[PDB]
Amino acid sequence: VKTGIAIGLNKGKKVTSMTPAPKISYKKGAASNRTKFVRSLVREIAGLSPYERRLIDLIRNSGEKRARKVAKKRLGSFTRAKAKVEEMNNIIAASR
């Protein structure tokens, strides 16, 4: 909430408020039941890629840190490496 001055943590002039509506191009990419089903089945068919096969071995042997590093290098970024390693951890904990 505003303060009514030109500086500070919450600066600016006070207007009443409105919460107009939730837009539908904000819940984009959210997982639907169809997407979940299709993607689970396609994983069951196609299986693993070679770097994923390496990752599942290296999490068991080497720990998650080497997995995060090599996944950051094979992919682009650490943000994606984290999620890939979490995916592989879940695959391992499920199949095992």
């Binding site: 299709v38 396609v42 068919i45 196609a46 299986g47 693993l48 890629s49």
Partner: protein
């Protein structure tokens, strides 16, 4: 629907089934010619979303393009100027191979208009694209108002002028502070702002 499964499966390119299919189809395409008519799309979902419709007047051409950098065809690699140009095998050809393929296919089929194109396969030597084309003399497309715009004459050699998606990307046409030098045309903006505007009553 099956197109969703096709999409999610074609995203998994390094799996065994897809690398097998790749290894077979690349050999087939390499035994065939460089440009050749495809009876049907290898990728119906991709063609469908790019604008193909399984009816008369929609055409698919498979095309092959050599890979690598651009070489300047001066005799004996000599440029006859300042040395700062660069090593000669390190030039990159701002237009993409997809655009090259589109333009060669449109030159072979000049009666058709190039709607779009998409990657199918590649090798060390060659890349492979499927190009979607339209017949504007066909009555089914002269009618059917969703595609009667391709029949107007401002859509001649879209691929040669850079109006397909790869052309827009290679020109750098998008909105933002990043595409400031090329948003309405690089040369247009250059001619606009390297221009001395002088009014009657001088400012």
């Amino acid at each position: 629907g099956a197109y969703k499964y096709l999409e999610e499966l074609q995203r998994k390119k390094q799996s065994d089934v897809l690398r097998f299919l790749q290894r077979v189809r690349v050999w087939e395409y390499r035994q065939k010619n460089v440009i050749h008519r495809a009876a049907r799309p290898t990728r119906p979902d991709k063609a469908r979303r790019l604008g193909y419709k399984a009816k008369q007047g929609f055409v698919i051409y498979r095309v092959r393009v050599r890979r690598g950098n651009r070489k300047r065809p001066v005799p004996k690699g000599a440029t006859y100027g300042k040395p700062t140009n660069q090593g000669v095998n390190e030039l990159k050809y701002q237009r993409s191979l997809r655009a090259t393929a589109e333009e060669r296919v449109g030159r072979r089929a000049a009666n058709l208009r190039v709607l779009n194109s998409y990657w199918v396969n590649q090798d060390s030597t060659y890349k492979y694209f499927e190009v979607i084309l339209v017949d504007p003399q066909h009555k089914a497309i002269r009618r059917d108002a969703r595609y009667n715009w391709i029949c107007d004459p401002v859509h001649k050699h879209r691929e040669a002028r850079g109006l397909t998606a790869t052309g827009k990307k290679s020109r750098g046409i998008n909105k933002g502070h990043k595409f400031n030098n090329t948003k309405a045309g690089r040369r247009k903006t250059w001619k606009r702002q390297n221009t001395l505007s002088l009014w009657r009553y001088r400012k």
